[PDB]
Write a protein that binds this ligand. Structure first.
Ligand SMILES: Nc1ncnc2c1ncn2[C@@H]1O[C@H](COP(=O)(O)OP(=O)(O)OP(=O)(O)O)[C@@H](O)[C@H]1O
Ligand SMILES: Nc1ncnc2c1ncn2[C@@H]1O[C@H](COP(=O)(O)OP(=O)(O)OP(=O)(O)O)[C@@H](O)[C@H]1O
Ligand SMILES: [Mg+2]
Ligand SMILES: [Mg+2]
Lengths: 842, 398, 116, 415
């Protein structure tokens, strides 16, 4: 019950509210003045219970009607203020809003923080309740926001300000209202909220954050959000606005990492240095330094990688003297991938022709591509060795050499463009293998280029009726992955015409799946323009109509997180009815690629995939491991590996094959000794089937990629920056792997080399302002945010001290433990430039 | 093989602030859960073979199915099986049974009427052991532990790093530590660290009290310990946490005490499981005890327990970290200076800091305040801290 | 009366603990004097409701699980749960108002209003 | 002081409302329905079908299984206690059905009276209890699992510093077996039992593992948890059947690991004590030595607390030789360091004599822990070679960090 002070205050409140019965002149001003005074005193204090509000439980009906009849001036406004404060505690949402709306304006700050928050919530509720039928109510709510937002800004309440500004769908005022000490908080809030908000508000929020960062001149972050938006005009605007040459070099490094090559005018000083950095010619050299820091110059051999000295030699000296072709292809992939990018191998460099001569047709192409893939990012160094094998006796393997070129020029660009020159006279080659090699090399060398000359040169291949189905598919995929995430009308129209003119009998083959691929590869991350795409694709008949629609639906929403598209895809998967299950497989890959945008969505996609596996039909069971591989590329999560190990022994050969490839992709480059042991056990168990052995050895090569210093992650910048080229590469490999026997185990091993398009390295090489390497002590650990929305860089814990260059595993980041240097980019990934601290004093 | 049964956990939703970002992440979780529900509801609804297989096998075996103990395998289809009443019967082994699974002492499903071997029971796990397995991972994570960097690093190198990165251990040649005892004054973070590692680990986790592994009947104690460790072996990557090992880890000594000798037999079986004849495999053991000096040397010796992680009373930096973590969900005022609580030598532990925060919240609620102040914390310090009586000598020492 | 008589002549049903469900159609139970039995489940009884250690009832003919029944409690532990509440009152406690409020801050406030 | 006022319902409503409620209600409801949804998924899947011995369909494919079920009949196992032999024409047979009862039955016409000898176990029909089939003699399952049948990979070169202990062990468990002629010529009966005792971690179980590794005879690793049975006298019967199985094998080896478990001291002032465990220990004592000579059964026993053993068991007629494992000397500790650092990726300049001298009173297990900790230190800072400083830090972390409280100011007392 009450107290003496409480009872006296209750009596005073009751007297003040009861005096309003009649219309005496000295009632409305005195009583409302007293109520205003008490309410303001209680509300403008600590969060203590508002004692006047607790005591006040009257009815305002008489108060509302008298409001209607008495004092059209300020007294009704005082009454409105009082009833608004009273109804903030009660449930009078619309009335409580309109009391502040039409009553005494004064200011929302004069009431209290809680009153401001409640008014903000009610304003958001009304705005969501108000449609475009009338804009009369919108303007006063906007005026309320005009004062609500600065209140939150000045009282560290940026949460409510940002939320309200997202409800009203208007975010322009953040440009003119954000302070120096609060830009990071709101910017991080937006860059985290963009992933979960659906279309089209995510793009508006992204451009709002872009404008904020431009206003505060945080140019690297502006570049990050510009690549998030995937629009070149604002990237060019940021490039022009960058007046600091060190920031220019940093943004060139990040552009090269993302693979975005924008033409630079000669008006910008130091054009040559920026161009050569963006071409990423230096990377290999740094990689070499990397390797000579870890004493891993010496390349490995497949015999030691398989560890034959440990396998139980049940048949000794009688069952291993025969060298089958398929195991030779697997050993080529191993003695490639494992030793790749180190500039040397002990079996393909000194005994090349002898090795290649024990391969047949497809083995020739695979080994020729692996010869270039054993030396990465050295265009001249790679081609100096590739030319002789291009001059080979078996001119059919010439195409393979082109792959080598295309696999050597990957991740780099030259002014003279050796790849374009070398393949310009070979693209029009009538031989199917020659044209295939030419187009594949051109695509791999020019991933993400979007250069009009190469696209125009690739156009006539689609209209060539002579060109075979697999030539058409490889051409379509190369065109798509040269024009990743651009919605190029030229390529879209060309592929649409090619598929429209294609016959059903010729469409029934597996390679026709690669026709939507490039089309889909033209529309990565842009789901707005795909209504016309689906309308155009609706002309073709089912089932391939549904197949193409599903594939373009995946490609449109790559990482979008649109749960409605995932619901449609899950409905497709759950429909229990050969080619009919292709739709379900593509939809499963769609759930994977949409959910990999967000960590939460991905981890729930894990549970959905488990449910699909334990309760799905054979086609879904085959499809899921590819999805699991897509979800966690180069992220050896133990639960995923355990599920894949459980299903590697399944009685369905396709399911086991897909599970093995999922081991290879998920644990790629992590050098996981547990994964290596499990793969050795799988090789021992599957020692009889050539296909299982081939794919398990491929998985071992993938997991020993670069001796553990290479990753296939399509994500960068704390996994927030997507990579269109890498996403394209994994998409091609996975959709080809939807049919392992006909494509992977058939005539199309070269498709595996598309993963090298996604081949991106991990280091911590630190450069000075002049780009010389600089050893800096670095604190490396997990980025587990021990705070909420404090704006912290996840507050790296699990500390370990390192000297650069350093190797960072997936999910573990780094920070500068020394204040002597300041990084231009606060995200310590890849090559960075540290400016000497001017604030530090000796 | 029977790979690990890792506990399931929902993704962490951060920030923990009551903002729209938390709403969006939680609603994404709800979306995906509803997707799973819709798929799992429409799966069996659209299900239109093996039914003949079931109608034959189940009819042949019939219900109920008795559970007996295999004793001898006479022929390829005849076996001497002892029923639970201890009576042996020469019964037949039906065709639909894997002859390689039958081993002496195995649990075998028999027909109710003719007791013929109709199948083999695989698990036959003691209910007191299957309850030790953790199904719901605890919510406490490594981000909820203030300070304790050395202790967390040691426990990660022991039970976490070998699972994720066995490459270092295999390359250098070390066998990773397979036994850790978390010892120190109470309320320092031993059980909290066990909760955190259980949350983080991808391997199966078994939680023991060090006293539930003790049974009434004469031989069921060591047998229960053996069953628990065998279950840990089954799910190969395993972590066996035995809180309050003091209950059984006490030092061996000679007395009549007919129950104490069984106590010592149980602890002897435990140390045999830890390191005795035959290898232990890839199962780690985490032990916690307030008093370590009272433990038997043969239990905490290296090889059985490789690491002894000390949990001291938190220092100034650690105490400040505890206060920052445990008031993160609070709404602190501007007049609060936590430093005064962190300084002085009250010898307050992490649990003491948690109680201080809780009592400060209660003090604020007493004044009808949802935001705490410095005075509330000061009152809570004296209100809660009154634990020890004297603990100190007089003014002898200058 | 006739229905009571007819229900009476029905054989008494065994009561057995539950180790775990096995099939969504069979349950591993443990009767008092004999050992374990893998038994069928009644049509009305749902498998997702028979949890381990739940003390089901099995028919005397085929040991069919027909009732879920209340959970087992060690007879000695059940005697520790008070049924007839005592007669003491807060108004019968003198001089401990501060103590009463302090204890009720833990025994009443959290359970009644955990939202605070 | 001012008494705390009660919290009225209006106050509760205000505190739970006058604050964050824009998203608090929605967040809480979403969390609650998330928990309910998780429960729904778990319930709706909720099977995890238990594995049962269902063979692959092609394995059985037998519609004659029902024919075997109905045609063949179950037989209860019972040992023929006695032959009555009334007139050698209606002989009668007294059988004992385990614990059921004992009966006077006759054989079925299928079997011959000469094929059913006294004392063996036979199958009897469940109705007329007539003998139907002779059975092989009972072999306890757990007793046959007590055997090792899988030699561990611990050789004798992995036990450093125990040269005398190894030689005395091989003198009792290896030499009298491989080359018995070296003893009978001198008329010496070699000891038939060895008690391995010493500080924990000194290498008793390691030496037992080496013995089992190169035994070449029947090795039985007795489990101390199985001699301890629920029912009265079952542990004694366990010992009897174990010794009988050992006698069946030619010159078997038995290793009672951790003998303190069932080798306590007999007593009666405790008003009952163990009794059953004491009875099992007494039967083991009887089997070891006494009437009914044990035979060629060399017995291995290990315990790192020997002072609690029964003097009757400790008497040198059951455990004749008492090999003691002591803390290794400097040379032995150097040998242990070299053994345990053999596979490590360490430097070639490590002075292992220094490290051995830095651990004065340390068992071999502590040396292994020191090596592992040196590797851990070399891993923490990611060096691929473990240097001398890493080993010194490991020695400080393992030995000195937990040895005593003799701090450096207190350690200044010695120079
Ligand atoms: N270092 C710490 N960081 C954060 N919270 C801590 C810390 N130490 C203790 N706590 C808090 O104290 C609570 C109780 O401590 P905990 O359960 O870890 O006890 P303990 O050290 O295992 O003690 P005991 O000897 O009773 O087993 C934890 O739930 C946690 O919230
Ligand atoms: N001389 C030695 N050489 C090498 N390693 C040794 C030596 N002595 C002991 N060890 C190590 O000690 C470890 C554990 O010792 P062990 O198992 O023999 O203990 P124990 O003394 O029998 O103790 P308990 O009292 O538990 O029976 C072994 O794994 C082995 O690596
Ligand atoms: Mg605890
Ligand atoms: Mg031992």
């Amino acid at each position: 019950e009450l107290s003496e002070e409480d009872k006296q205050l209750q009596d005073e409140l009751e007297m003040l509210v009861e005096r309003l019965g009649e219309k005496d002149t000295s009632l409305y001003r005195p009583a409302l003045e007293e109520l205003r005074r008490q309410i303001r005193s209680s509300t403008t204090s600590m969060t203590s219970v508002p004692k006047p509000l607790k005591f006040l439980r009257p009815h305002y009906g008489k108060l509302k009607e008298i409001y209607e009849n008495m004092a059209p001036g300020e007294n009704k406004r005082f009454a409105a203020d009082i009833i608004s404060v009273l109804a903030m505690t009660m449930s009078g949402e619309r009335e409580c809003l309109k009391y502040r709306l039409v009553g005494s304006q004064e200011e929302l700050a004069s009431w209290g923080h809680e009153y401001v928050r409640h008014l903000a919530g009610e304003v958001a509720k009304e705005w969501q309740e108000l449609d475009d039928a009338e804009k009369v109510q919108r303007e006063p709510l906007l005026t309320l926001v005009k004062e609500i937002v600065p209140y939150n800004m000045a009282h560290n309440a940026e949460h409510e300000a940002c939320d309200l500004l997202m409800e009203i769908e208007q975010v322009d005022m953040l440009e003119k209202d954000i302070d120096e000490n609060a830009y990071a908080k709101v910017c991080l809030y937006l860059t985290s909220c963009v992933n979960y908000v659906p279309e089209p508000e995510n793009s508006a929020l992204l451009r709002c954050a872009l404008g904020v960062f431009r206003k505060f001149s945080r140019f690297p972050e502006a570049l990050r959000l510009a690549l998030m938006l995937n629009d070149m005009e604002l990237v060019e605007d940021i490039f022009t606005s960058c007046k600091d040459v060190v920031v220019q070099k940093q943004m060139a490094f990040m552009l090269g990492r993302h693979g975005v090559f924008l033409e630079l005018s000669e008006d910008v000083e130091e054009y040559e240095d920026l161009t050569e950095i963006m071409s990423n010619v230096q990377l290999n050299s740094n990689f070499l330094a990397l390797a000579r820091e870890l004493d891993i110059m010496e390349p490995k051999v497949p015999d030691d990688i398989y560890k034959t000295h440990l396998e139980n030699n049940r048949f000794g000296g009688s069952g291993s003297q025969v060298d089958s072709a398929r195991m030779n292809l697997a050993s080529s992939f191993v003695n490639g991938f494992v030793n790749a990018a180190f500039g040397q191998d002990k079996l393909l460099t000194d005994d090349g022709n002898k090795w290649l001569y024990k391969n047949k047709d497809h083995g020739m192409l695979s080994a020729a591509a692996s010869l270039g893939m054993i030396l990465l990012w050295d265009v001249d160094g790679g081609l100096t060795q590739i030319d002789k094998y291009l001059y080979s006796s078996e001119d059919y393997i010439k195409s393979g050499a082109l792959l080598a070129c295309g696999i050597v020029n990957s991740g780099v660009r030259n002014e003279c463009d050796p790849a374009l020159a070398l393949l310009s006279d070979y693209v029009l080659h009538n031989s199917n293998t020659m044209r295939l090699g030419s187009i594949f090399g051109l695509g791999l060398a020019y991933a993400g280029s979007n250069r009009e000359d190469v696209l125009t040169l690739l156009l006539p291949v689609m209209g060539d009726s002579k060109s075979s189905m697999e030539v058409a598919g490889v051409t379509a995929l190369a065109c798509g992955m040269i024009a990743v995430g651009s919605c190029n009308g030229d390529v879209t129209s060309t592929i649409l015409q090619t598929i429209m003119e294609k016959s059903e009998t010729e469409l029934k083959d597996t390679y026709a799946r690669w026709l939507p691929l490039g089309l889909g590869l033209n529309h990565l991350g842009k789901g707005e323009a795909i209504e016309a795409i689906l309308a155009a694709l609706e002309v073709v008949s089912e089932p391939f109509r549904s197949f193409a629609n599903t594939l373009v639906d995946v490609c449109a929403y790559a990482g979008s997180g649109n749960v409605l598209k995932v619901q449609q895809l899950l409905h497709i998967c759950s429909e229990h009815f050969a080619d009919m299950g292709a739709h379900q497989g593509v939809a499963v890959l769609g759930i994977a690629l949409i959910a990999m945008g967000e960590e939460i969505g991905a981890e729930m996609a894990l549970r959905t995939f488990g449910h699909l596996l334990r309760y799905g039909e054979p086609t879904l069971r085959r499809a899921v491991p590819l999805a699991l591989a897509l979800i966690s590329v180069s992220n050896p999560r133990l639960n995923i590996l355990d599920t894949l190990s459980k299903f590697s022994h399944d009685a369905d050969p396709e399911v086991s094959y897909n599970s093995i490839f999922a081991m290879g992709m998920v644990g790629s480059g992590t050098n996981n000794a547990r994964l290596a042991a499990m793969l050795r056990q799988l090789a021992q168990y599957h020692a009889k089937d050539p296909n299982n052995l081939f794919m398990v050895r491929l998985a071992q090569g993938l997991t020993h990629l670069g001796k553990g210093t290479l990753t296939l992650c399509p994500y960068h910048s704390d996994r927030q920056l997507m990579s269109q080229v890498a996403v394209a590469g994994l998409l091609t490999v996975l959709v080809s792997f939807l049919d392992v026997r006909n494509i992977i185990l058939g005539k199309s091993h070269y498709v595996l080399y598309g993963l090298v398009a996604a081949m991106q390295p991990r280091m911590l090489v630190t450069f000075d302002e002049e780009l010389r390497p600089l050893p800096v002590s670095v604190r490396v650990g997990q980025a587990v945010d021990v705070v909420g929305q404090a704006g912290k860089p996840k507050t790296i814990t699990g500390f370990q001290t390192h000297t650069t260059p350093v190797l960072l595993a997936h999910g573990e980041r780094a920070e500068l433990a020394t204040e002597e240097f300041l990084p231009v980019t606060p995200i310590l990934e890849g090559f960075v430039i540290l400016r000497k601290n001017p604030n530090y004093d000796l | 093989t029977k790979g690990p049964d890792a506990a399931s956990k929902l993704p962490l939703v951060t920030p923990h602030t009551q903002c729209r970002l938390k709403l969006l992440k939680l609603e994404r979780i709800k979306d995906y859960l509803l997707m799973e529900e819709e798929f799992i509801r429409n799966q069996e609804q659209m299900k239109p073979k093996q039914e003949e297989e079931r109608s034959k096998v189940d009819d042949l075996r019939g219900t109920p199915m008795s559970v007996g103990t295999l004793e001898e395998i006479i022929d390829d289809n005849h076996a001497i099986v002892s029923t639970s009443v201890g009576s042996e019967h020469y019964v037949s082994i039906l065709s639909f049974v894997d002859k390689d699974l039958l081993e002496p002492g195995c649990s075998v499903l028999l027909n109710h009427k003719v007791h013929a071997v109709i199948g083999v029971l695989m698990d036959d796990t003691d209910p007191l052991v299957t309850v030790m397995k953790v199904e719901k991972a605890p919510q406490e994570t490594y981000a909820d532990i203030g300070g304790l960097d050395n202790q967390i690093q040691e426990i990660k190198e022991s039970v976490e790093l070998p699972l994720t990165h066995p490459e270092y251990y295999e390359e250098m040649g070390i066998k990773p530590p397979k036994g850790v005892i978390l010892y120190g004054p109470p309320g320092t973070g031993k059980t909290l660290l066990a909760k955190a590692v259980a949350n983080q680990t991808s391997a199966t986790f078994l939680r023991v009290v060090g006293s539930e592994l003790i049974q009434k009947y004469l031989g069921d104690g060591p047998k229960l310990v053996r069953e628990l460790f065998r279950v840990a072996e089954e799910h190969a990557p395993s972590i066996v946490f035995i809180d309050e090992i003091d209950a059984i880890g006490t030092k061996r000594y000679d007395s009549n005490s007919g129950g104490e000798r069984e106590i010592q037999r149980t602890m002897l079986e435990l140390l045999n499981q830890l390191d005795g004849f035959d290898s232990r495999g890839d199962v780690k053991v985490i032990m916690a005890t307030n008093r370590i000096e009272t433990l038997d040397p043969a239990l905490i010796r290296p090889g059985r327990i490789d690491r002894k992680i000390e949990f001291p009373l938190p220092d100034e930096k650690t105490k400040k970290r505890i206060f920052q973590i445990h008031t993160s969900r609070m709404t602190l005022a501007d007049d609060v200076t936590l430093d005064d609580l962190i300084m002085a030598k009250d010898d307050l532990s992490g649990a003491d800091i948690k109680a201080i925060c809780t009592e400060a919240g209660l003090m604020a609620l007493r004044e009808r305040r949802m935001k705490v102040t410095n005075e509330d914390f000061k009152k809570s310090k004296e209100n809660v801290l009154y634990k020890k009586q004297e603990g100190t000598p007089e003014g002898l020492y200058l | 009366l006739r229905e009571e008589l007819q229900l009476l002549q029905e054989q008494g049903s065994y009561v057995g603990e539950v180790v775990r469900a096995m099939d969504k159609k069979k349950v591993l139970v443990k009767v008092h004097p004999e050992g374990k039995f893998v038994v069928d489940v009644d049509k009305n009884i749902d498998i997702n409701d028979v949890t381990p250690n739940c003390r089901v009832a099995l028919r005397n003919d085929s040991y069919t699980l027909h009732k879920i029944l209340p959970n087992k409690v060690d007879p000695l532990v059940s005697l520790m749960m008070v049924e007839k509440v005592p007669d003491s009152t807060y108004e019968m406690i003198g001089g401990l108002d501060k103590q009463i409020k302090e204890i009720k801050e833990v025994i009443e406030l959290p359970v009644k209003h955990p939202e605070l | 002081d001012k008494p705390i006022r009660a919290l009225d319902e209006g106050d509760i409503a205000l505190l739970k409302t006058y604050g964050q409620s824009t998203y608090s209600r929605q967040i809480k409801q979403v969390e609650d329905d998330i928990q309910q949804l998780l429960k729904k998924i778990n319930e709706l899947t909720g099977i995890k079908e238990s594995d049962t011995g269902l063979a692959p369909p092609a394995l059985w494919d037998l519609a004659a299984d029902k024919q075997t079920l109905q045609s063949e009949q179950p037989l209860q196992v019972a040992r023929c206690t006695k032959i009555i032999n009334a007139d050698s024409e209606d002989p009668k047979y007294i059988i004992n059905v385990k614990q059921f009862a004992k009966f006077v039955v006759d054989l079925s016409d299928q079997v011959a009276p000469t094929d059913i000898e006294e004392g063996m176990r036979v199958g009897v029909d469940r109705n007329k209890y007539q003998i139907h089939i002779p059975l092989p003699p009972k072999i306890d399952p757990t007793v046959t699992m007590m055997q090792v049948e899988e030699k561990p990979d611990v050789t004798y070169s992995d036990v450093g510093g125990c040269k005398e202990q190894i030689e005395k062990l091989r003198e009792v468990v290896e030499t009298p077996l491989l080359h018995p002629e070296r003893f009978v010529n001198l008329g010496i009966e070699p000891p038939k039992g060895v008690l391995l005792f010493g500080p924990p971690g000194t290498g008793k179980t390691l030496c037992a593992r080496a013995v089992a590794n190169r035994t070449d005879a029947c090795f039985i690793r007795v489990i101390g948890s199985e001699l301890v049975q629920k029912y009265v006298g079952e542990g004694a019967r366990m010992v009897r059947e174990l010794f009988e199985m050992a006698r069946t094998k030619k010159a078997c080896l038995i290793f009672f690991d951790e003998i303190d478990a069932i080798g306590g001291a007999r007593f009666d002032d405790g008003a009952g004590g163990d009794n059953e465990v004491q009875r099992t220990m007494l039967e083991l004592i009887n089997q070891l030595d006494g009437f009914d000579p044990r035979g060629n059964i060399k017995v291995l026993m290990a315990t790192n607390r020997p002072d609690t053993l029964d003097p009757a068991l400790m008497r040198p007629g059951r455990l004749d030789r008492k090999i003691e494992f002591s803390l290794p000397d400097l040379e032995g500790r150097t040998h242990i360091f070299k053994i345990h650092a053999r596979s490590m990726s360490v430097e070639r300049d490590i002075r292992f004599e220094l490290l051995a001298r830095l651990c004065p009173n340390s068992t071999g297990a502590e040396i292994r822990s020191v090596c592992t900790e040196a590797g851990m230190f070399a891993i923490r800072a990611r060096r691929k070679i473990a240097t001398e400083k890493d080993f010194l830090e490991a020695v400080n972390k393992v030995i000195k960090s937990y040895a005593k409280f003799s701090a450096t100011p207190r350690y200044m007392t010695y120079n």
